[PDB]
């Protein structure tokens, strides 16, 4: 393969220093390598400087706080799906993480890599978007946080997201599920392992004692450059109780917005339909959790 | 909603090249200690032909399987075995090994004979030439037989070749005798179709195959299990797409051309059916390709049964499921 | 491009090599260490044929750069044998009929072993999920799964 | 059922030990001293003549030992499992995407790729044919010879015109299957060299070494006894490794450099260049009486054999001989036409046209059973082949026929395991 | 010897020896026996192989008398009271008839 | 082959002897020389054993 | 003991290797360079089987220390072939019957080549003495000599 300089910093400080030094190359970070190594092997990426950050064990962590959950960028999907709290109370992330590639890919692949690749069909991407996550980006210049939605909308040294050439994502944060809140994820794909999502359906909600829906998040992973925001549908739920008939009432809305916003997608005619089958399952999931 | 259905698919498959000569050959040598070598060109590409020939040679020669050594697919020291295709090797190379063993047995039988009797004598069976033919007594071990063979200056070597007995087909009506033996199968499959997402889950499959007689039950079952899985993929996952601009295949990679993973495979109940009279080794016929065929029509039929409509085109993808379902409504 | 030094424990022994960093771990194992049991069936993480046990976990070596094996403990098929003899797991693949063409086998065995070293008595469901990263075009997985189940039972059997 | 000494027993395979121990060597696992690596420069257009080909810049790269085109072949340049319509290296014209035009041998895989990247070419593009409809239009360019019609078969048995008039039920439908790829887990790989005693040799992933040999010997103008083909432990084929893959390109580079030449294909190139299953469309009309007995079957089918014949001949006839299904049908007529197109080469894929045929005959049987309100298994047992049945080719079954047992055993098992 | 017995060019003959896995026992190379004993084994192996070549050739009027020798072509006992036939035409007829020419042979001094 | 197989108690078919290009024997190479000594060592070490007198 | 640097022209190309000096030139060629045509039949300079052309002159490599091949021009049997084909001398050895077991052949050819490269038209006696350093137990030397005489004649043209 293409020649290149290879660095493997032992601390976050050294990594930041390296990223800064070679920021104009620019540098190519490598974590699990499940995206990059292939991009390099197939010659889609031709780096001159590679910065391996796998030795930064400090970035591997899952800290469950009172109201937020902080996940280190180097956390593998295997570490994520195996975390008892994640597996128990944040179903959307659990299902997404447990369905990324295969165990081998899950053992190597990190959430930082997934979000940094920002693939149209990214399952970590879809789940974290559904949960309205926030990411922390650091460099020798300091640190900043931004909603994953803004991280995706922005454009840094690359268009896929706001990352700068000298930045390194260090952590992802999501709100911790309260007593009565729930999230669901459904991966629509061709086979039960090593499958690329056709629709990565994500849904999350909050309710206020009386059972009234207070917050709603409905995302169509893979039905847009970034997970399709079913805004109109969410707003239909906020302000009323959550029942199958109230959630299904949004179905024609999901249909219409997929056909409108996914107008130029090749399989729009199929997805505007299947997205309805997907969310119905999500409705079931959400409802059973709240009950 | 989820709808299940069951479908049946039966098939027929001629063994060997269609009305064309397509022989195979083999060489055999029995050593002084009752062990042996077998040489045949037939390529083993995972199906198990090398093992089959060994078991066949063992049975035919009456020696232990573990005592047989086999060499194949080397044009310098193994005779042409024809191509490993048309589910023909067990039949053709298999018979070629038997013939090879028979020639080699000529001297063995003559030396064994030299003990009162001749041809009529069931030589071979658990490492000993039994006088059996009316009196299983007056036995003799292979160790004892080779001793006699040596003392007589005789060696057990043989060469064999076989060609299915077939006729060419007339061009006007295709009349003639294309195959000397055919394999049969019936597979019943159960699936569950999601009417709203179009997902098709293959739950259970029962696949019965007429193999004449199995040379190795486990190997035959593997062919069937692999075949059923290849069938599932044929109908629900596998599809090469072609760029009609430059003619390039668009999805040549493993990530874009989908084959079943271990979590997709259904419960597979295989059934080995025997039939008599077959011209193959001990009456055995092919299953390599037969193992795949019936699964395909069964899965299709099963989806039709679950949905209540017809599907005459493969593959049947989620989009095709939804279109059919929507076409049943308004 | 400067060469790098990679220190790792390969198949039981501490190895050290100074080599160019621009190669995958798959290439390092196959070319520099001669472990041809590590297969390349796809080059994109899908087939699992290039699987090796990495710090206790099955990983696809075609998705990794050579330098990432630094400070690691790796076990390839060559390192499963016990004194040149088939381990129990290997003996089970031999007998269960889990082997047809044998190309996916190194990966299958390593993934199975990685599981058994962590959980000696897995449920059938756990065995399946654990090996879902290995594709096979010959067996239909049935007997490969049987081999692992048989190994688990015989292992328990050894309760003498 | 016959007390066999060893037959039927689940004996450990004679080749499983090397596979579980990791010592078994597949073609790509072979390496020799002074061995060179090889790659192929392939067409990126579907149908076209080569106006110019520059290999000078590729040859000038330090580390590249050879860059050859068809001019380097000393023997013949036409091959094929059945019909010799495939070149080793394109001479007259490109007929598909990925057509082999030139080969490179170099000290490292990177040098090979560098050599390929340095080769330039100019095509005079002809019309790429991708539909059987256009292929059959006689004004369309002929990919081979003077017509795109590759094979034609006609099976006439009894009298279907008369038969259909005696039927109580007739189901008619058009069936079609798609294009698939073998996807054996081991990509094509091979290595050639002259051994210690000067023997030209090729270790390769193949299903038919003896066939491979004849082709290599024919290319190098050598007797068959002087070309050794060794089938390495093969990681599956399913029909996709019957056609020549790397044997000739390697042997040719070895003949010229006298050194070992290793060629391992990327999964991508392996799929792009190897054969595929023939997509087919079958128009069928099946007739029977009220009791569900078959009286006549009529099929009119078409097959896309792609750019080269490969097993095209074997597929059209096998499919023609089996398309009525494993059933006694006193009247059958079959018309089959396979055509050449610039689509990927269609060849042998597990089944030789029968998988496609079964989709048809079984689809027909199930529609019959449903309409006559019969059990799908019963309608099949009723018409099933039995020793003595007369086949559509005039052949009478004399032995080894257990179709009815598969039918009964299958249903009995399904009743038990799936609630049939 | 093989070339003479078969009537083929010495240059077209390839041989392999002394490899227990694929070559049959040829006894020890001593007592000046090889040319005699292995030499006859070869001829006998050739004759068996010639059984299908002769049968195939003979299917052109004749049988035992044929003479499968000299410059790659199976002539006739006498000469040409019925023309000869080339090995090339013979091998094509062998193929068309689905026959292969293989043989095994052993010999032991009397 | 027989002798080696005997020494290791293996059936003849499981022991392969390859007569390499031989530089003369004249009778001095009919008896066993290094066959059993090499094989014996390869049997115990499982590695290739070369012996050149 | 420190490794020494050895520079030499082996079979037409400039090679250079750093290795321990505690070995014979024969070992260096066979082991370090893989030239196994150079045989070792006695280890005492008698058979000649280990003969190689050392600076236009044949020598017994079993009598030389690896380091002594420094700054020299060595040609072994592998270096005789012309672009992979048998030279005239080699062709003559083939047709003359000068080859039985072939263990002595490499040395014989190298000695005969060294001679012919200095004396194109040698006398049968000059040929004999020239190769008297190589022992053969198979041919009786007759046909080996004939091959050399054979080559010389074809050399005339
Ligand atoms: C066989 C296979 C199957 C797959 N299946 C799935 C699937 O089902 N779902 C899915 O979502 N994805 C899938 N993937 C893609 C991949 O596994 C994920 O995107 C993964 O999470 C990426 O993590 P990584 O650590 O490997 O990243 P890498 O490949 O190392 O890198 C990702 C990219 O982001 C950059 N980057 C990495 N870490 C950081 C950081 N912390 N800060 C800043 N930039 C950084 C890298 O420089 C690079 O450009 C698959 C890949 C393979 C090979
Ligand atoms: N009576 C029988 C018949 C078959 N068998 C088993 O099943 C195998 C298939 O035998 P057979 O049907 O005679 O077919 P071939 O040996 O000629 O194998 C080729 C066949 O094998 C198939 N199955 C395959 N299996 C593997 N693992 N890999 C391939 O590439 C395969 N390719 C396909 C295709 S396509 C073909 S044409 C045998 O080796 C044997 O182990 C048996 O035990 N007893
Ligand atoms: N009618 C004949 C007889 C012999 N030959 C030739 O002379 C050789 C000898 O043949 P034969 O007499 O049958 O003897 P073997 O082939 O069995 O050889 C063994 C014999 O060969 C002898 N000569 C030897 N020659 C060489 N080069 N090397 C040995 O080790 C030799 N050992 C000895 C001893 S001892 C013995 S026992 C054959 O290979 C042949 O090339 C021939 O062309 N025509
Ligand atoms: O190779 C052939 O010509 C062939 C193979 C199978 C069936 N019919 C023909
Ligand atoms: O050159 C040959 O024909 C040869 C060499 C060694 C063993 N068998 C044959
Ligand atoms: O190679 Mo399958 O007929
Ligand atoms: O080996 Mo000489 O009889
Ligand atoms: S080559 Fe690594 S997963 Fe396929
Ligand atoms: S046994 Fe062939 S791919 Fe698994
Ligand atoms: S080994 Fe040098 S002369 Fe004999
Ligand atoms: S030919 Fe044998 S020593 Fe000379
Ligand atoms: Ca000896
Ligand atoms: Mg082939
Ligand atoms: Mg074709
Ligand atoms: Se096939």
mmCIF file of C-alpha atoms in Angstrom, chain B residues 6 8-14 16 18 41 43-46 51 55 58-59 62-63 65-66 72-76 78-80 83-86 125-126 169 172-179 182 184-186 188 190 204 206 208 210 213-219 223 227 230 234 238-240 242 244 246-249 252 254 257 269 271 273-279 282 285 288-289 292-293 296-297 301 310 312-315, chain D residues 2-14 44-46 97 130 153-156 173-181 183 199 206-210 213 227-231 234 236 238 242 267-268 271-272 276-277 317-318 321-322 324-327 343-344 349-352 354-355 358-359 361-363 366-367 376-377 380 385 391 393 395 397 399-403 405-407 409-411 413-414 417-420:
data_model
loop_
_atom_site.group_PDB
_atom_site.id
_atom_site.type_symbol
_atom_site.label_atom_id
_atom_site.label_comp_id
_atom_site.label_asym_id
_atom_site.label_seq_id
_atom_site.Cartn_x
_atom_site.Cartn_y
_atom_site.Cartn_z
ATOM 1 C CA UNK B 6 -44.950 -23.544 3.412
ATOM 2 C CA UNK B 8 -42.739 -27.680 -1.840
ATOM 3 C CA UNK B 9 -40.161 -28.096 -4.571
ATOM 4 C CA UNK B 10 -39.190 -31.354 -6.215
ATOM 5 C CA UNK B 11 -36.460 -31.881 -8.759
ATOM 6 C CA UNK B 12 -34.764 -34.260 -11.138
ATOM 7 C CA UNK B 13 -31.091 -34.124 -12.167
ATOM 8 C CA UNK B 14 -29.225 -36.263 -14.672
ATOM 9 C CA UNK B 16 -22.785 -36.874 -15.680
ATOM 10 C CA UNK B 18 -25.661 -34.769 -20.975
ATOM 11 C CA UNK B 41 -7.462 -36.950 -11.398
ATOM 12 C CA UNK B 43 -10.493 -32.603 -8.210
ATOM 13 C CA UNK B 44 -11.803 -32.352 -4.656
ATOM 14 C CA UNK B 45 -13.101 -28.808 -4.247
ATOM 15 C CA UNK B 46 -14.513 -29.278 -0.772
ATOM 16 C CA UNK B 51 -12.617 -39.154 0.939
ATOM 17 C CA UNK B 55 -14.133 -45.261 1.411
ATOM 18 C CA UNK B 58 -11.752 -49.574 1.276
ATOM 19 C CA UNK B 59 -15.139 -51.254 0.891
ATOM 20 C CA UNK B 62 -11.879 -55.049 2.125
ATOM 21 C CA UNK B 63 -9.212 -52.934 3.839
ATOM 22 C CA UNK B 65 -10.364 -46.794 5.474
ATOM 23 C CA UNK B 66 -7.471 -45.503 7.578
ATOM 24 C CA UNK B 72 -5.542 -36.463 -6.779
ATOM 25 C CA UNK B 73 -5.527 -33.512 -9.173
ATOM 26 C CA UNK B 74 -1.908 -33.704 -10.297
ATOM 27 C CA UNK B 75 -1.708 -34.197 -14.072
ATOM 28 C CA UNK B 76 1.829 -35.585 -13.836
ATOM 29 C CA UNK B 78 -2.835 -38.992 -11.689
ATOM 30 C CA UNK B 79 -4.886 -40.010 -14.771
ATOM 31 C CA UNK B 80 -7.477 -37.628 -16.210
ATOM 32 C CA UNK B 83 -14.003 -32.105 -14.664
ATOM 33 C CA UNK B 84 -15.442 -32.052 -11.191
ATOM 34 C CA UNK B 85 -18.857 -30.833 -12.346
ATOM 35 C CA UNK B 86 -22.271 -32.259 -13.202
ATOM 36 C CA UNK B 125 -14.057 -57.485 4.380
ATOM 37 C CA UNK B 126 -12.412 -56.358 7.619
ATOM 38 C CA UNK B 169 -29.395 -36.390 -28.577
ATOM 39 C CA UNK B 172 -34.584 -32.327 -34.393
ATOM 40 C CA UNK B 173 -36.396 -33.616 -31.300
ATOM 41 C CA UNK B 174 -33.623 -34.082 -28.683
ATOM 42 C CA UNK B 175 -34.392 -37.802 -28.543
ATOM 43 C CA UNK B 176 -31.907 -40.264 -27.039
ATOM 44 C CA UNK B 177 -30.358 -41.382 -23.727
ATOM 45 C CA UNK B 178 -28.728 -38.293 -22.111
ATOM 46 C CA UNK B 179 -28.063 -39.803 -18.652
ATOM 47 C CA UNK B 182 -30.930 -39.412 -12.361
ATOM 48 C CA UNK B 184 -34.362 -36.875 -7.218
ATOM 49 C CA UNK B 185 -35.356 -34.630 -4.348
ATOM 50 C CA UNK B 186 -38.236 -32.982 -2.554
ATOM 51 C CA UNK B 188 -40.497 -28.396 1.832
ATOM 52 C CA UNK B 190 -41.439 -22.739 5.852
ATOM 53 C CA UNK B 204 -37.507 -24.446 8.635
ATOM 54 C CA UNK B 206 -36.931 -30.438 5.162
ATOM 55 C CA UNK B 208 -35.023 -35.302 1.058
ATOM 56 C CA UNK B 210 -32.400 -39.866 -3.404
ATOM 57 C CA UNK B 213 -26.616 -45.072 -1.330
ATOM 58 C CA UNK B 214 -24.492 -42.550 0.592
ATOM 59 C CA UNK B 215 -20.714 -43.023 0.591
ATOM 60 C CA UNK B 216 -20.458 -40.848 3.716
ATOM 61 C CA UNK B 217 -23.674 -39.726 5.407
ATOM 62 C CA UNK B 218 -22.090 -36.705 7.089
ATOM 63 C CA UNK B 219 -20.575 -35.442 3.833
ATOM 64 C CA UNK B 223 -23.857 -30.918 0.756
ATOM 65 C CA UNK B 227 -27.133 -26.383 -0.818
ATOM 66 C CA UNK B 230 -27.188 -21.444 -1.179
ATOM 67 C CA UNK B 234 -30.510 -17.465 -4.463
ATOM 68 C CA UNK B 238 -28.087 -12.836 -4.044
ATOM 69 C CA UNK B 239 -28.269 -10.603 -7.090
ATOM 70 C CA UNK B 240 -25.525 -9.407 -9.409
ATOM 71 C CA UNK B 242 -24.818 -4.841 -14.198
ATOM 72 C CA UNK B 244 -25.435 -1.273 -18.872
ATOM 73 C CA UNK B 246 -19.827 -0.055 -19.449
ATOM 74 C CA UNK B 247 -21.048 -3.588 -18.735
ATOM 75 C CA UNK B 248 -19.296 -3.813 -15.378
ATOM 76 C CA UNK B 249 -20.716 -5.764 -12.459
ATOM 77 C CA UNK B 252 -18.535 -7.694 -7.025
ATOM 78 C CA UNK B 254 -18.636 -9.527 -0.370
ATOM 79 C CA UNK B 257 -23.295 -9.329 -3.030
ATOM 80 C CA UNK B 269 -33.822 -31.439 8.484
ATOM 81 C CA UNK B 271 -33.347 -36.946 4.729
ATOM 82 C CA UNK B 273 -33.134 -41.604 0.502
ATOM 83 C CA UNK B 274 -31.678 -44.766 -1.013
ATOM 84 C CA UNK B 275 -32.704 -46.352 -4.332
ATOM 85 C CA UNK B 276 -31.572 -49.652 -5.883
ATOM 86 C CA UNK B 277 -30.116 -50.710 -9.217
ATOM 87 C CA UNK B 278 -27.934 -47.657 -9.780
ATOM 88 C CA UNK B 279 -24.891 -48.078 -12.105
ATOM 89 C CA UNK B 282 -22.359 -49.696 -4.804
ATOM 90 C CA UNK B 285 -25.372 -41.350 -7.526
ATOM 91 C CA UNK B 288 -23.570 -32.040 -5.240
ATOM 92 C CA UNK B 289 -25.915 -29.954 -7.342
ATOM 93 C CA UNK B 292 -29.228 -26.905 -4.124
ATOM 94 C CA UNK B 293 -31.980 -27.131 -6.738
ATOM 95 C CA UNK B 296 -35.241 -22.579 -4.698
ATOM 96 C CA UNK B 297 -38.766 -23.482 -5.892
ATOM 97 C CA UNK B 301 -43.842 -21.444 -3.219
ATOM 98 C CA UNK B 310 -47.762 -15.522 -7.355
ATOM 99 C CA UNK B 312 -42.634 -16.145 -11.086
ATOM 100 C CA UNK B 313 -39.438 -14.071 -11.034
ATOM 101 C CA UNK B 314 -36.369 -14.254 -8.762
ATOM 102 C CA UNK B 315 -34.995 -12.751 -6.671
ATOM 103 C CA UNK D 2 -26.700 -53.814 3.018
ATOM 104 C CA UNK D 3 -24.066 -54.198 5.733
ATOM 105 C CA UNK D 4 -21.169 -52.200 4.320
ATOM 106 C CA UNK D 5 -17.747 -52.497 5.959
ATOM 107 C CA UNK D 6 -17.077 -48.752 5.759
ATOM 108 C CA UNK D 7 -19.479 -47.254 3.216
ATOM 109 C CA UNK D 8 -21.929 -44.734 4.664
ATOM 110 C CA UNK D 9 -19.823 -44.131 7.769
ATOM 111 C CA UNK D 10 -18.990 -40.607 8.905
ATOM 112 C CA UNK D 11 -15.271 -41.157 8.469
ATOM 113 C CA UNK D 12 -13.010 -38.170 9.085
ATOM 114 C CA UNK D 13 -12.042 -36.792 5.668
ATOM 115 C CA UNK D 14 -8.555 -37.634 4.378
ATOM 116 C CA UNK D 44 -13.059 -0.777 -18.978
ATOM 117 C CA UNK D 45 -15.389 -0.793 -21.987
ATOM 118 C CA UNK D 46 -17.871 -3.552 -22.995
ATOM 119 C CA UNK D 97 -15.896 -5.298 -19.370
ATOM 120 C CA UNK D 130 -27.098 -5.797 -22.867
ATOM 121 C CA UNK D 153 -32.435 -26.626 -29.077
ATOM 122 C CA UNK D 154 -35.801 -28.140 -29.748
ATOM 123 C CA UNK D 155 -37.324 -31.051 -27.911
ATOM 124 C CA UNK D 156 -40.407 -32.546 -29.535
ATOM 125 C CA UNK D 173 -46.960 -18.040 -16.961
ATOM 126 C CA UNK D 174 -43.624 -16.457 -17.811
ATOM 127 C CA UNK D 175 -40.809 -17.194 -15.368
ATOM 128 C CA UNK D 176 -37.349 -15.684 -15.094
ATOM 129 C CA UNK D 177 -34.305 -15.962 -12.892
ATOM 130 C CA UNK D 178 -31.422 -13.571 -12.334
ATOM 131 C CA UNK D 179 -27.660 -13.348 -12.548
ATOM 132 C CA UNK D 180 -25.694 -14.712 -9.584
ATOM 133 C CA UNK D 181 -22.036 -15.207 -8.653
ATOM 134 C CA UNK D 183 -18.813 -16.434 -4.173
ATOM 135 C CA UNK D 199 8.966 -29.121 -15.709
ATOM 136 C CA UNK D 206 -9.349 -25.233 -9.907
ATOM 137 C CA UNK D 207 -12.029 -27.873 -10.443
ATOM 138 C CA UNK D 208 -10.447 -29.423 -13.556
ATOM 139 C CA UNK D 209 -6.606 -29.563 -13.691
ATOM 140 C CA UNK D 210 -6.498 -31.825 -16.765
ATOM 141 C CA UNK D 213 -3.297 -28.420 -18.740
ATOM 142 C CA UNK D 227 2.840 -29.268 -18.655
ATOM 143 C CA UNK D 228 2.066 -30.052 -15.035
ATOM 144 C CA UNK D 229 -1.109 -28.804 -13.420
ATOM 145 C CA UNK D 230 -1.451 -29.291 -9.685
ATOM 146 C CA UNK D 231 -4.843 -28.607 -8.144
ATOM 147 C CA UNK D 234 -9.266 -25.504 -3.307
ATOM 148 C CA UNK D 236 -14.661 -23.983 -3.237
ATOM 149 C CA UNK D 238 -19.434 -24.403 -7.390
ATOM 150 C CA UNK D 242 -14.003 -24.672 -14.351
ATOM 151 C CA UNK D 267 -12.268 -10.565 -4.555
ATOM 152 C CA UNK D 268 -13.449 -7.783 -6.847
ATOM 153 C CA UNK D 271 -16.090 -11.711 -9.299
ATOM 154 C CA UNK D 272 -15.823 -9.269 -12.217
ATOM 155 C CA UNK D 276 -21.991 -16.177 -13.637
ATOM 156 C CA UNK D 277 -25.273 -18.088 -13.606
ATOM 157 C CA UNK D 317 -29.415 -28.586 -23.282
ATOM 158 C CA UNK D 318 -29.541 -29.670 -19.651
ATOM 159 C CA UNK D 321 -33.958 -31.899 -21.046
ATOM 160 C CA UNK D 322 -35.240 -31.223 -17.497
ATOM 161 C CA UNK D 324 -40.791 -30.484 -17.703
ATOM 162 C CA UNK D 325 -39.775 -31.506 -14.200
ATOM 163 C CA UNK D 326 -39.357 -34.963 -12.536
ATOM 164 C CA UNK D 327 -42.806 -35.949 -13.843
ATOM 165 C CA UNK D 343 -23.067 -8.807 -20.283
ATOM 166 C CA UNK D 344 -20.728 -10.709 -17.937
ATOM 167 C CA UNK D 349 -23.093 -22.453 -11.483
ATOM 168 C CA UNK D 350 -24.365 -25.363 -9.370
ATOM 169 C CA UNK D 351 -27.268 -26.806 -11.336
ATOM 170 C CA UNK D 352 -26.402 -26.111 -14.997
ATOM 171 C CA UNK D 354 -31.908 -26.727 -13.722
ATOM 172 C CA UNK D 355 -32.312 -24.312 -10.828
ATOM 173 C CA UNK D 358 -37.241 -25.879 -11.502
ATOM 174 C CA UNK D 359 -38.501 -22.397 -10.708
ATOM 175 C CA UNK D 361 -41.800 -26.585 -13.533
ATOM 176 C CA UNK D 362 -42.473 -26.338 -9.777
ATOM 177 C CA UNK D 363 -44.250 -23.017 -10.150
ATOM 178 C CA UNK D 366 -48.065 -25.595 -7.452
ATOM 179 C CA UNK D 367 -50.537 -23.538 -9.511
ATOM 180 C CA UNK D 376 -48.866 -30.012 -3.544
ATOM 181 C CA UNK D 377 -47.150 -33.279 -2.500
ATOM 182 C CA UNK D 380 -46.414 -34.634 -7.456
ATOM 183 C CA UNK D 385 -41.308 -40.693 -12.205
ATOM 184 C CA UNK D 391 -39.034 -39.780 -20.608
ATOM 185 C CA UNK D 393 -36.332 -37.965 -24.899
ATOM 186 C CA UNK D 395 -35.682 -42.862 -22.571
ATOM 187 C CA UNK D 397 -36.220 -45.342 -16.546
ATOM 188 C CA UNK D 399 -33.473 -48.332 -12.144
ATOM 189 C CA UNK D 400 -32.613 -46.126 -9.151
ATOM 190 C CA UNK D 401 -35.706 -43.926 -8.963
ATOM 191 C CA UNK D 402 -36.827 -42.801 -5.522
ATOM 192 C CA UNK D 403 -38.718 -39.579 -6.169
ATOM 193 C CA UNK D 405 -39.909 -41.666 -1.312
ATOM 194 C CA UNK D 406 -38.457 -38.131 -1.102
ATOM 195 C CA UNK D 407 -42.002 -36.796 -1.486
ATOM 196 C CA UNK D 409 -40.539 -38.819 3.653
ATOM 197 C CA UNK D 410 -40.388 -35.042 3.192
ATOM 198 C CA UNK D 411 -44.073 -34.505 3.960
ATOM 199 C CA UNK D 413 -41.045 -35.014 8.369
ATOM 200 C CA UNK D 414 -42.608 -31.590 7.713
ATOM 201 C CA UNK D 417 -41.360 -30.472 12.425
ATOM 202 C CA UNK D 418 -43.319 -27.606 10.876
ATOM 203 C CA UNK D 419 -46.975 -28.578 11.118
ATOM 204 C CA UNK D 420 -47.540 -29.468 7.471
#
